Amino acid sequence: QVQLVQSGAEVKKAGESLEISCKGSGYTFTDHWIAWVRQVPGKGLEWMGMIYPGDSDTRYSPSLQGRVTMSADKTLSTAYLQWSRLEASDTAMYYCARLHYSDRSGSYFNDVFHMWGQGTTVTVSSASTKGPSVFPLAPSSKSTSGGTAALGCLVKDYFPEPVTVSWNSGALTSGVHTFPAVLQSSGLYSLSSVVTVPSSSLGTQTYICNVNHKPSNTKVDKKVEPKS
Amino acid sequence: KRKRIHIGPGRAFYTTK
Amino acid sequence: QSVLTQPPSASGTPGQRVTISCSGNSSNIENNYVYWYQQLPGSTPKLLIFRDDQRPSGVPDRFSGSKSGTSASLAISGLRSEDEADYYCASWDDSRGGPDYVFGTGTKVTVLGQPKANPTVTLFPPSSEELQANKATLVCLISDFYPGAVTVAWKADGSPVKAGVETTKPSKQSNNKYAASSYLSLTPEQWKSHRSYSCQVTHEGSTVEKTVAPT
């Protein structure tokens, strides 16, 4: 059983050093190239480059800034992805893959990434604990559709997750859509909660969204109105 | 060694060794 | 340069057949080998084909690879609900003095479990009170579409903007259709300066557009 087994999740802060590993067994580890592949949550696969355990020759993807490197121990038959100083955008899934395949008729292919590791998930946070700001998403002509209107609460600039939302102290529970959070380049989160309501009632009913963020112990109430 | 990678028909790198 | 271009999404009815293009250069696919990978949600990529059209033992023959010239294709026959995954092509680029591996942009394959539906867009501009706090954000809401795959694109006046955009992965709802959200980050300056900003959403070949101005 040819096997590539990786080291396991790491949660880190921006600026800290890190190593992850990939251990081949049940073959002559020093025979075949090992490569590293990165995948940012929701984005696709990227080639980072490769290492040759035999003589530790490496070839790096043209866009590896030189903060990230590769190494190989002939003793423990293991390969390493290394960082001197992690930053926010290092956050991804990292797989290792060995360059070799053999079909059952003994044929020998030297360019084929058949065997993969389970991945090492790596999280890097670049942000302190911040309670969220809330801003109203007012209903309007452009917002109303027949006898129906959308209004929302923009809950932004918070860390860490999660936040919770409710409308009119829970009394209103339909039809309420609270979307998934988005990660900004500032290291902080945002999300939007929207409700559709009857437009006949837009000038007589009150709408208040309720925002609760436990890590920072903050509660916020915002009244969402039309515009005069 | 067998550090040889064959990238296509009649095309290789690390041919030696 | 160095980018293998794949359509963002593709689709098929069950038992039917879908194909994915993979488009590159003379520096890569034309003369160099090609490989294909399947990536199921949450899981490790699996090699489906190597050296243009060979499939490792253990892989059905309904996966079929072809290549001609500057491009290549992955044929998926006998379309099953378990084929529903992300597909990536790859090959070697030699623009430099050595063997660089490169993956394609990726293709989301959904197996039709219902009928197609185009999305509805609602776009909110920045609120007065966010402007007072000297910040600005445009919120674009994309809802009730199938399959669950869209491309969103923003424009200032009529030109693309890629600064400060993030988009959510689509997820499923109380009409069994997908919804997502996109955010554009701006300065009150930027917002005030331009004629309009637009949020624009492409879905299985159809484009919808909603637009806002600072007035």
CSV table of C-alpha atoms in Angstrom, one decimal:
chain,number,residue,atom,x,y,z
A,1,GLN,CA,0.0,0.0,0.0
A,2,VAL,CA,1.7,3.1,-1.4
A,3,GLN,CA,0.7,6.0,1.0
A,4,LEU,CA,1.0,9.8,1.3
A,5,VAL,CA,-0.1,11.0,4.7
A,6,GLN,CA,-0.2,14.7,5.7
A,7,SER,CA,0.1,16.5,9.1
A,8,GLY,CA,-3.3,18.1,9.9
A,9,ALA,CA,-5.0,21.4,10.5
A,10,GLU,CA,-3.2,24.5,11.7
A,11,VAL,CA,-4.9,27.7,12.9
A,12,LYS,CA,-2.4,30.6,13.1
A,13,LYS,CA,-2.0,34.4,13.2
A,14,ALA,CA,-0.5,36.7,10.6
A,15,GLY,CA,3.3,36.9,10.9
A,16,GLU,CA,3.9,33.5,12.6
A,17,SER,CA,6.1,30.8,11.1
A,18,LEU,CA,4.7,27.4,10.0
A,19,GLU,CA,5.6,24.1,8.6
A,20,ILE,CA,3.4,21.3,7.2
A,21,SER,CA,4.5,17.8,6.2
A,22,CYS,CA,3.8,14.9,3.8
A,23,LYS,CA,5.1,11.4,4.6
A,24,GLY,CA,5.4,8.7,1.9
A,25,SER,CA,5.7,5.1,2.9
A,26,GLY,CA,5.5,1.6,1.2
A,27,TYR,CA,7.8,2.7,-1.7
A,28,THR,CA,11.3,4.2,-2.1
A,29,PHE,CA,10.4,7.8,-1.1
A,30,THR,CA,13.6,9.2,-2.6
A,31,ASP,CA,12.7,8.0,-6.1
A,32,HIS,CA,9.8,10.3,-7.0
A,33,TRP,CA,9.0,14.0,-7.1
A,34,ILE,CA,6.6,15.5,-4.6
A,35,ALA,CA,4.4,18.5,-5.4
A,36,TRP,CA,2.4,21.0,-3.4
A,37,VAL,CA,-1.1,22.3,-4.4
A,38,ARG,CA,-3.0,25.1,-2.8
A,39,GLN,CA,-6.8,25.8,-2.8
A,40,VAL,CA,-8.3,29.0,-1.3
A,41,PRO,CA,-11.8,28.3,0.0
A,42,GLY,CA,-14.2,28.6,-2.9
A,43,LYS,CA,-11.5,29.1,-5.5
A,44,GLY,CA,-9.8,26.4,-7.6
A,45,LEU,CA,-6.5,24.4,-7.6
A,46,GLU,CA,-3.1,26.1,-7.9
A,47,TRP,CA,0.4,24.5,-8.5
A,48,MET,CA,2.9,25.7,-5.9
A,49,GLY,CA,5.9,23.7,-7.2
A,50,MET,CA,7.8,20.6,-6.4
A,51,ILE,CA,10.7,18.9,-4.5
A,52,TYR,CA,12.9,16.0,-5.5
A,53,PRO,CA,13.6,13.9,-2.3
A,54,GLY,CA,16.6,12.3,-3.9
A,55,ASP,CA,18.8,15.4,-4.0
A,56,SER,CA,16.4,18.0,-2.7
A,57,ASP,CA,16.1,19.9,-6.0
A,58,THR,CA,13.1,22.1,-6.1
A,59,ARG,CA,11.1,24.0,-8.7
A,60,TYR,CA,8.9,26.8,-7.6
A,61,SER,CA,5.7,28.2,-9.2
A,62,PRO,CA,6.6,31.6,-10.7
A,63,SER,CA,4.3,33.4,-8.3
A,64,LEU,CA,5.6,32.0,-5.0
A,65,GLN,CA,6.9,35.2,-3.5
A,66,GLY,CA,9.9,33.6,-1.8
A,67,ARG,CA,8.2,33.5,1.6
A,68,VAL,CA,7.3,29.8,1.0
A,69,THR,CA,9.7,27.0,0.5
A,70,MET,CA,10.0,23.2,0.3
A,71,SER,CA,12.3,20.6,2.0
A,72,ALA,CA,12.8,16.9,2.2
A,73,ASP,CA,14.1,14.5,4.9
A,74,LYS,CA,15.5,11.2,3.5
A,75,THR,CA,15.6,9.9,7.1
A,76,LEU,CA,11.8,10.1,7.9
A,77,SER,CA,10.9,10.0,4.2
A,78,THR,CA,8.9,13.2,4.6
A,79,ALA,CA,8.3,16.4,2.6
A,80,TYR,CA,7.7,19.9,4.0
A,81,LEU,CA,5.9,23.0,3.0
A,82,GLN,CA,7.5,25.9,4.9
A,83,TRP,CA,6.7,29.6,5.7
A,84,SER,CA,8.9,32.1,7.4
A,85,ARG,CA,6.1,34.7,8.0
A,86,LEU,CA,2.5,33.7,7.3
A,87,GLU,CA,0.1,36.3,5.9
A,88,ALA,CA,-3.7,36.4,5.6
A,89,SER,CA,-3.8,35.1,2.0
A,90,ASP,CA,-2.0,31.9,2.9
A,91,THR,CA,-5.3,30.6,4.1
A,92,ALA,CA,-6.1,27.5,2.1
A,93,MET,CA,-6.3,23.8,1.7
A,94,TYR,CA,-2.8,22.3,0.9
A,95,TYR,CA,-2.4,18.9,-0.8
A,96,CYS,CA,0.7,16.9,-1.6
A,97,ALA,CA,0.9,14.7,-4.7
A,98,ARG,CA,3.5,12.3,-5.9
A,99,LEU,CA,4.6,12.1,-9.5
A,100,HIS,CA,4.2,8.5,-10.5
A,101,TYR,CA,1.7,5.9,-11.9
A,102,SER,CA,1.8,2.2,-12.6
A,103,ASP,CA,-0.9,0.4,-14.6
A,104,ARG,CA,-1.4,-3.3,-13.9
A,105,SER,CA,0.5,-4.4,-17.1
A,106,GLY,CA,3.7,-3.1,-15.3
A,107,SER,CA,4.0,0.1,-17.4
A,108,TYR,CA,5.8,2.9,-15.8
A,109,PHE,CA,4.7,6.6,-16.1
A,110,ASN,CA,6.8,9.3,-14.6
A,111,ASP,CA,4.7,12.4,-15.2
A,112,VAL,CA,1.4,11.4,-13.6
A,113,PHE,CA,0.0,12.7,-10.3
A,114,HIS,CA,-1.9,9.6,-9.3
A,115,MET,CA,-1.4,9.5,-5.5
A,116,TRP,CA,-2.6,12.4,-3.3
A,117,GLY,CA,-2.6,13.2,0.4
A,118,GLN,CA,-5.8,14.1,2.4
A,119,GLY,CA,-4.9,17.7,2.5
A,120,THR,CA,-3.8,20.0,5.3
A,121,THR,CA,-6.2,22.8,6.1
A,122,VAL,CA,-4.5,26.0,7.2
A,123,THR,CA,-6.2,29.1,8.6
A,124,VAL,CA,-4.5,32.5,9.1
A,125,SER,CA,-6.3,35.4,10.8
A,126,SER,CA,-5.2,39.0,10.5
A,127,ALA,CA,-7.7,40.7,12.9
A,128,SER,CA,-8.5,41.5,16.5
A,129,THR,CA,-12.0,41.1,18.1
A,130,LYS,CA,-14.4,43.7,16.8
A,131,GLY,CA,-18.1,44.2,17.2
A,132,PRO,CA,-20.1,44.9,14.1
A,133,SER,CA,-21.5,48.2,12.7
A,134,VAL,CA,-25.0,48.0,11.3
A,135,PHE,CA,-26.4,50.0,8.4
A,136,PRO,CA,-30.0,50.0,7.0
A,137,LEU,CA,-30.9,48.8,3.5
A,138,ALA,CA,-33.9,51.0,2.9
A,139,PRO,CA,-36.9,49.9,0.8
A,140,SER,CA,-37.6,52.0,-2.2
A,141,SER,CA,-39.3,52.0,-5.6
A,142,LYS,CA,-36.4,50.0,-7.0
A,143,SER,CA,-36.8,47.7,-4.0
A,144,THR,CA,-40.5,47.0,-4.3
A,145,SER,CA,-42.0,44.4,-6.6
A,146,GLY,CA,-45.8,44.3,-7.0
A,147,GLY,CA,-47.3,44.4,-3.5
A,148,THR,CA,-43.9,43.3,-2.0
A,149,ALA,CA,-40.8,45.1,-0.7
A,150,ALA,CA,-37.3,44.1,0.3
A,151,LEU,CA,-35.5,45.8,3.1
A,152,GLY,CA,-32.4,44.7,5.0
A,153,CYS,CA,-29.6,45.2,7.6
A,154,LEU,CA,-26.0,45.4,6.5
A,155,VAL,CA,-23.9,43.9,9.4
A,156,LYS,CA,-20.3,44.8,8.7
A,157,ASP,CA,-16.7,45.0,10.0
A,158,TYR,CA,-16.8,42.3,12.6
A,159,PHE,CA,-14.5,39.5,14.0
A,160,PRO,CA,-14.7,36.6,14.6
A,161,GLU,CA,-17.7,34.6,13.6
A,162,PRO,CA,-20.6,34.2,14.0
A,163,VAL,CA,-23.2,36.9,14.3
A,164,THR,CA,-26.9,36.3,14.8
A,165,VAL,CA,-29.8,38.3,13.3
A,166,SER,CA,-33.5,38.6,14.1
A,167,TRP,CA,-36.2,41.0,13.1
A,168,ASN,CA,-38.7,42.8,15.4
A,169,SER,CA,-37.4,40.9,18.4
A,170,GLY,CA,-38.2,37.6,16.8
A,171,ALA,CA,-41.9,38.4,16.2
A,172,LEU,CA,-41.2,38.6,12.5
A,173,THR,CA,-39.8,35.3,11.1
A,174,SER,CA,-40.8,35.4,7.5
A,175,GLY,CA,-39.7,35.7,4.8
A,176,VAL,CA,-36.3,36.4,6.2
A,177,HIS,CA,-33.1,35.6,4.4
A,178,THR,CA,-29.8,35.9,6.3
A,179,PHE,CA,-27.0,35.3,3.8
A,180,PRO,CA,-23.6,33.8,4.5
A,181,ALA,CA,-20.7,36.0,5.7
A,182,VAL,CA,-18.0,37.3,3.4
A,183,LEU,CA,-14.3,37.7,4.3
A,184,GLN,CA,-12.9,41.1,3.5
A,185,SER,CA,-9.3,41.9,2.7
A,186,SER,CA,-9.2,43.8,6.0
A,187,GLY,CA,-9.5,40.4,7.9
A,188,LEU,CA,-13.0,41.5,9.0
A,189,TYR,CA,-16.4,39.9,8.1
A,190,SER,CA,-19.7,41.3,6.8
A,191,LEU,CA,-23.1,39.8,6.1
A,192,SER,CA,-26.6,40.9,5.0
A,193,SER,CA,-30.0,40.0,6.3
A,194,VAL,CA,-33.0,40.8,4.2
A,195,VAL,CA,-36.8,40.4,4.7
A,196,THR,CA,-39.6,40.8,2.1
A,197,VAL,CA,-42.7,42.5,3.5
A,198,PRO,CA,-45.9,44.0,2.1
A,199,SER,CA,-45.4,47.4,0.6
A,200,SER,CA,-48.9,48.6,1.7
A,201,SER,CA,-47.5,48.6,5.3
A,202,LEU,CA,-44.2,50.5,4.6
A,203,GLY,CA,-45.4,53.7,6.1
A,204,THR,CA,-47.3,52.4,9.1
A,205,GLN,CA,-45.3,49.4,10.3
A,206,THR,CA,-42.0,49.5,12.2
A,207,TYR,CA,-39.0,47.4,11.2
A,208,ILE,CA,-36.1,46.8,13.6
A,209,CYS,CA,-33.3,44.3,13.0
A,210,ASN,CA,-31.5,42.8,16.1
A,211,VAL,CA,-27.8,42.0,15.9
A,212,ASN,CA,-25.9,40.0,18.6
A,213,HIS,CA,-22.2,39.2,18.5
A,214,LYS,CA,-21.0,37.2,21.5
A,215,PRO,CA,-17.2,37.3,21.2
A,216,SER,CA,-17.3,41.1,21.7
A,217,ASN,CA,-20.5,41.2,23.8
A,218,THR,CA,-22.3,43.7,21.6
A,219,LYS,CA,-26.0,44.1,20.8
A,220,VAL,CA,-27.3,46.4,18.1
A,221,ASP,CA,-30.8,47.5,17.1
A,222,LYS,CA,-31.5,49.3,13.8
A,223,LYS,CA,-34.7,50.7,12.5
A,224,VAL,CA,-35.1,50.2,8.7
A,225,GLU,CA,-37.3,52.8,7.2
A,226,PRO,CA,-38.1,54.3,3.7
A,227,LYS,CA,-36.8,57.8,2.8
A,228,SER,CA,-38.6,61.1,3.1
B,1,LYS,CA,18.1,8.6,-11.3
B,2,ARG,CA,14.5,8.2,-12.5
B,3,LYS,CA,14.1,11.8,-11.6
B,4,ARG,CA,13.3,12.0,-15.3
B,5,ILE,CA,10.0,13.7,-16.2
B,6,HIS,CA,8.5,13.2,-19.7
B,7,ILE,CA,6.3,16.1,-20.5
B,8,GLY,CA,5.0,15.0,-23.9
B,9,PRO,CA,6.0,13.0,-27.1
B,10,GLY,CA,9.7,13.3,-27.5
B,11,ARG,CA,10.0,15.8,-24.7
B,12,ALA,CA,11.7,15.5,-21.3
B,13,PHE,CA,13.6,17.3,-18.5
B,14,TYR,CA,16.2,16.0,-15.9
B,15,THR,CA,17.3,13.6,-18.6
B,16,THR,CA,20.7,13.3,-17.0
B,17,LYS,CA,20.5,11.8,-14.6
C,1,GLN,CA,0.2,34.7,-19.3
C,2,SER,CA,0.0,30.9,-18.1
C,3,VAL,CA,-3.7,30.3,-17.6
C,4,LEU,CA,-5.8,27.3,-18.9
C,5,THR,CA,-9.3,28.7,-19.6
C,6,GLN,CA,-12.3,26.6,-18.7
C,7,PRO,CA,-16.0,27.5,-18.7
C,8,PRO,CA,-17.1,28.3,-15.1
C,9,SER,CA,-20.1,25.9,-15.2
C,10,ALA,CA,-21.7,23.2,-17.4
C,11,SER,CA,-24.7,21.0,-17.2
C,12,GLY,CA,-26.6,17.9,-18.3
C,13,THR,CA,-29.8,15.9,-17.8
C,14,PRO,CA,-29.4,12.5,-16.1
C,15,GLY,CA,-28.2,9.7,-18.5
C,16,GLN,CA,-27.2,12.4,-21.0
C,17,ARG,CA,-23.6,13.6,-21.9
C,18,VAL,CA,-21.7,16.8,-21.0
C,19,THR,CA,-18.3,18.1,-22.3
C,20,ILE,CA,-15.8,20.6,-20.8
C,21,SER,CA,-13.4,22.6,-22.9
C,22,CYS,CA,-9.9,23.5,-21.8
C,23,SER,CA,-8.1,26.2,-23.7
C,24,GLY,CA,-4.4,27.1,-23.6
C,25,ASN,CA,-1.3,27.9,-25.6
C,26,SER,CA,1.6,26.5,-27.7
C,27,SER,CA,3.7,26.8,-24.5
C,28,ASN,CA,1.5,24.2,-22.9
C,29,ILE,CA,-1.3,21.9,-24.2
C,30,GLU,CA,-0.4,21.9,-27.9
C,31,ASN,CA,2.7,19.7,-27.6
C,32,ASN,CA,2.6,18.7,-23.9
C,33,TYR,CA,0.5,16.0,-22.2
C,34,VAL,CA,-2.9,16.8,-20.6
C,35,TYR,CA,-4.5,15.4,-17.3
C,36,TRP,CA,-8.0,15.7,-15.8
C,37,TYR,CA,-9.1,15.8,-12.2
C,38,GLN,CA,-12.5,15.4,-10.4
C,39,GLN,CA,-13.0,17.1,-7.1
C,40,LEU,CA,-16.1,16.2,-5.1
C,41,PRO,CA,-17.3,18.7,-2.5
C,42,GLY,CA,-15.1,18.4,0.6
C,43,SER,CA,-12.6,15.9,-0.9
C,44,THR,CA,-9.2,15.1,-2.4
C,45,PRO,CA,-8.9,15.4,-6.2
C,46,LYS,CA,-8.9,12.2,-8.1
C,47,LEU,CA,-7.0,11.6,-11.3
C,48,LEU,CA,-9.4,10.7,-14.1
C,49,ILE,CA,-7.2,10.7,-17.2
C,50,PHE,CA,-3.5,11.1,-18.0
C,51,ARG,CA,-1.4,11.8,-21.2
C,52,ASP,CA,-4.4,13.2,-23.1
C,53,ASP,CA,-6.8,10.2,-23.1
C,54,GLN,CA,-5.6,7.3,-20.8
C,55,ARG,CA,-7.7,6.4,-17.7
C,56,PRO,CA,-6.1,4.8,-14.6
C,57,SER,CA,-7.4,1.3,-13.8
C,58,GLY,CA,-10.5,1.8,-11.6
C,59,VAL,CA,-12.0,4.5,-13.8
C,60,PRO,CA,-15.1,3.8,-16.0
C,61,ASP,CA,-14.9,4.3,-19.8
C,62,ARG,CA,-17.7,7.0,-19.7
C,63,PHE,CA,-14.9,9.4,-18.9
C,64,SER,CA,-13.2,10.1,-22.2
C,65,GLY,CA,-10.4,12.5,-23.1
C,66,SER,CA,-9.5,14.3,-26.3
C,67,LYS,CA,-7.1,17.0,-27.4
C,68,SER,CA,-6.6,18.8,-30.7
C,69,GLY,CA,-4.3,21.8,-31.2
C,70,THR,CA,-4.4,24.6,-28.7
C,71,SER,CA,-7.3,23.0,-26.7
C,72,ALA,CA,-8.8,19.8,-25.0
C,73,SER,CA,-12.1,18.2,-23.9
C,74,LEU,CA,-13.4,16.0,-21.2
C,75,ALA,CA,-16.4,13.8,-22.3
C,76,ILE,CA,-18.7,12.6,-19.5
C,77,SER,CA,-21.1,10.0,-20.8
C,78,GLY,CA,-24.1,8.4,-18.9
C,79,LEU,CA,-24.5,11.3,-16.6
C,80,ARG,CA,-25.1,10.3,-13.0
C,81,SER,CA,-25.9,12.4,-9.9
C,82,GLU,CA,-22.6,11.2,-8.4
C,83,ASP,CA,-20.6,12.8,-11.3
C,84,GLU,CA,-21.8,16.2,-9.8
C,85,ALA,CA,-18.4,17.8,-9.0
C,86,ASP,CA,-15.7,20.3,-10.0
C,87,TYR,CA,-13.5,19.4,-13.0
C,88,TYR,CA,-10.0,20.7,-13.6
C,89,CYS,CA,-7.7,20.2,-16.6
C,90,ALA,CA,-3.9,20.5,-16.4
C,91,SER,CA,-0.6,20.1,-18.3
C,92,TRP,CA,3.0,21.3,-18.4
C,93,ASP,CA,4.0,24.8,-19.4
C,94,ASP,CA,7.6,25.3,-20.7
C,95,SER,CA,7.7,29.2,-21.2
C,96,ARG,CA,10.6,28.9,-18.9
C,97,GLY,CA,13.6,26.4,-18.9
C,98,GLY,CA,11.7,23.7,-17.1
C,99,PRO,CA,8.6,21.7,-16.3
C,100,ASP,CA,5.9,23.8,-14.7
C,101,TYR,CA,2.5,22.2,-13.9
C,102,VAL,CA,-0.6,24.3,-14.4
C,103,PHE,CA,-4.3,23.7,-13.6
C,104,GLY,CA,-7.2,25.0,-15.5
C,105,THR,CA,-9.6,27.5,-14.0
C,106,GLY,CA,-12.2,24.9,-13.1
C,107,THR,CA,-15.7,23.7,-14.2
C,108,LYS,CA,-18.7,23.1,-12.0
C,109,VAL,CA,-20.8,20.2,-13.3
C,110,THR,CA,-24.4,20.0,-12.0
C,111,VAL,CA,-26.7,17.0,-12.8
C,112,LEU,CA,-30.1,18.4,-13.5
C,113,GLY,CA,-32.5,17.5,-10.7
C,114,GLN,CA,-35.1,20.1,-11.6
C,115,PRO,CA,-35.8,22.7,-14.4
C,116,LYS,CA,-33.5,25.6,-15.1
C,117,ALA,CA,-34.3,29.1,-13.7
C,118,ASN,CA,-32.6,32.5,-14.3
C,119,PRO,CA,-31.8,34.6,-11.2
C,120,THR,CA,-33.5,37.8,-9.8
C,121,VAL,CA,-31.3,40.7,-8.7
C,122,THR,CA,-31.9,43.3,-6.1
C,123,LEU,CA,-29.2,45.9,-5.6
C,124,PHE,CA,-29.0,48.3,-2.6
C,125,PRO,CA,-26.8,51.4,-2.7
C,126,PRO,CA,-24.8,52.7,0.3
C,127,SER,CA,-27.0,54.2,3.0
C,128,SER,CA,-26.8,57.8,4.2
C,129,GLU,CA,-25.5,56.6,7.6
C,130,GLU,CA,-22.7,54.5,6.1
C,131,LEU,CA,-21.7,57.5,4.1
C,132,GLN,CA,-21.6,59.6,7.3
C,133,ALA,CA,-19.2,57.0,8.8
C,134,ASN,CA,-17.0,57.6,5.7
C,135,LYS,CA,-17.5,54.2,4.2
C,136,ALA,CA,-19.5,52.8,1.3
C,137,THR,CA,-20.7,49.3,0.2
C,138,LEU,CA,-23.0,48.1,-2.5
C,139,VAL,CA,-25.0,45.0,-1.7
C,140,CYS,CA,-26.1,42.8,-4.7
C,141,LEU,CA,-28.6,40.1,-3.9
C,142,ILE,CA,-29.0,37.1,-6.3
C,143,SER,CA,-31.9,34.8,-5.8
C,144,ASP,CA,-34.1,31.9,-7.1
C,145,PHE,CA,-31.8,30.4,-9.9
C,146,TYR,CA,-30.9,26.8,-10.9
C,147,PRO,CA,-28.4,25.4,-11.3
C,148,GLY,CA,-26.5,26.8,-8.4
C,149,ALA,CA,-23.7,28.5,-10.3
C,150,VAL,CA,-23.3,32.2,-11.3
C,151,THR,CA,-20.6,34.6,-12.3
C,152,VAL,CA,-21.0,38.1,-10.9
C,153,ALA,CA,-19.4,41.2,-12.3
C,154,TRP,CA,-19.4,44.8,-11.3
C,155,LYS,CA,-19.0,47.9,-13.4
C,156,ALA,CA,-18.2,51.5,-12.7
C,157,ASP,CA,-20.0,53.6,-15.3
C,158,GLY,CA,-19.6,50.8,-17.9
C,159,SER,CA,-16.1,49.4,-17.1
C,160,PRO,CA,-15.1,46.4,-15.0
C,161,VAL,CA,-14.0,46.8,-11.3
C,162,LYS,CA,-12.3,43.9,-9.4
C,163,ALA,CA,-11.1,45.8,-6.4
C,164,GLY,CA,-12.8,44.9,-3.1
C,165,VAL,CA,-15.3,42.4,-4.4
C,166,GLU,CA,-16.3,39.3,-2.6
C,167,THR,CA,-19.0,36.8,-3.4
C,168,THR,CA,-20.6,34.0,-1.5
C,169,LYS,CA,-21.0,30.3,-2.6
C,170,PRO,CA,-24.6,29.7,-3.6
C,171,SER,CA,-26.7,27.7,-1.3
C,172,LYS,CA,-30.3,26.2,-1.3
C,173,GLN,CA,-33.6,27.7,-0.1
C,174,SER,CA,-37.3,27.5,0.8
C,175,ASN,CA,-38.2,27.2,-2.9
C,176,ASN,CA,-35.4,24.7,-3.5
C,177,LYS,CA,-33.5,27.1,-5.7
C,178,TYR,CA,-30.1,28.8,-5.0
C,179,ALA,CA,-29.2,32.2,-3.7
C,180,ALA,CA,-26.0,34.2,-3.2
C,181,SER,CA,-24.7,37.7,-2.3
C,182,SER,CA,-22.0,40.0,-3.7
C,183,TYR,CA,-20.4,43.0,-2.1
C,184,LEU,CA,-18.5,45.9,-3.7
C,185,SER,CA,-16.3,48.0,-1.4
C,186,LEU,CA,-15.9,51.8,-2.1
C,187,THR,CA,-14.9,55.2,-0.8
C,188,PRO,CA,-17.6,57.9,-0.5
C,189,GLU,CA,-15.4,59.6,-3.0
C,190,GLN,CA,-15.6,56.8,-5.6
C,191,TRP,CA,-19.3,56.4,-5.1
C,192,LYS,CA,-20.0,60.2,-5.5
C,193,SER,CA,-17.6,60.5,-8.5
C,194,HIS,CA,-19.1,58.1,-11.1
C,195,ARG,CA,-22.4,58.1,-13.0
C,196,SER,CA,-23.4,54.6,-12.0
C,197,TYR,CA,-22.3,51.3,-10.6
C,198,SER,CA,-23.8,48.1,-11.9
C,199,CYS,CA,-24.1,44.5,-10.5
C,200,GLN,CA,-24.1,42.0,-13.4
C,201,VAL,CA,-24.9,38.3,-13.2
C,202,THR,CA,-24.2,35.6,-15.8
C,203,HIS,CA,-26.0,32.2,-15.6
C,204,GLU,CA,-26.0,29.4,-18.2
C,205,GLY,CA,-25.4,32.0,-21.0
C,206,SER,CA,-27.9,34.7,-19.8
C,207,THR,CA,-27.0,38.0,-18.2
C,208,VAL,CA,-29.1,40.1,-15.9
C,209,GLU,CA,-28.1,43.6,-14.9
C,210,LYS,CA,-29.2,46.0,-12.1
C,211,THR,CA,-27.8,49.5,-11.7
C,212,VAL,CA,-27.5,52.4,-9.2
C,213,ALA,CA,-26.5,56.1,-9.2
C,214,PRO,CA,-25.6,58.5,-6.3
C,215,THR,CA,-28.5,60.9,-6.9
